[PDB]
Structures are given as structure tokens and as C-alpha cells.
Amino acid sequence: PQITLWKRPLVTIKIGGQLKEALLDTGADDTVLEEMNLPGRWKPKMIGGIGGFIKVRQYDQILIEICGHKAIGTVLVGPTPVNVIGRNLLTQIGCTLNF
């Protein structure tokens, strides 16, 4: 679909079998979700944002459905202010910016 930007581009995602709300974020290299339980091994990682660095759990090769479109990729779980879908998954569902 075509999504305008007068409101936040929030969409429903499905991950670990559960539905959540997330923000489509072209300024994020990576996908970062709020604290949750996910099945699968994970390794400690650090990621930096506007305010500094946070500690996250890196889950690799995670299945995630974004507005019905399937992606399989890296998901970081940690103290982010909002669930963000980054370019690592936006590219898998074929997202582009147009103006």
C-alpha cells in the first residue's frame, strides 16, 4: 500500500506468534522492539540512538510479518521508546520512499 506521513506510520506486526504495533522507521538501520519474550538463542549487543547506547538481545533469523508481508531477519529486543521496524526488514518487504 501507499502510506502517507501525517500520522505516525504504525502497523501491526506478528512476531513469536503475537501481534504488536510498530513504527516503520527509515532512519533506523536495525529493528528494535520493546522488552518481550522471544524463543530462540540470542547474543548480547549494543546499539546507539539519538541519546546514546543501549543494551539489547540480538535474535537472528526471526520470522516477522509486517502488514501481512513476511520477513526473516535480525530483531533486537531492548529498552527502546517504541517498537521500530528498520531498513533490515523494510528492504525485505519491498519498501521504498517516493516523492
Ligand X SMILES: CCOP(=O)(COc1ccc(C[C@H](NC(=O)O[C@H]2CO[C@H]3OCC[C@H]32)[C@H](O)CN(CC(C)C)S(=O)(=O)c2ccc3c(c2)OCO3)cc1)OCC
Binding site for ligand X (CB under 6 A): 23, 25, 27-30, 32, 47-50, 52-53, 81-82, 84, 86
Options 13-21, 33-41, 57-65, 74-82: segment touching a copy of itself (CB under 8 A):
74-82
Please, which residues have CB within 8 angstroms of residue 83's CB and are 6 or more apart in sequence?
13, 20, 21, 22, 23, 32, 33, 34
Integer Cα distance of 87 and 96 in angstroms: 10
Q: Is 25 a catalytic residue?
A: yes
Q: Are 15 and 62 in contact (CB under 8 A)?
A: yes
Residue in 21, 26, 36, 70 binding a copy of itself, rule: CB under 8 A: 26
Q: Are 76 and 56 in contact (CB under 8 A)?
A: yes
Residues that bind a copy of itself (CB under 8 A): 1-6, 8-9, 23-29, 32, 47-54, 67, 69, 80-82, 84, 87, 90-91, 93-99
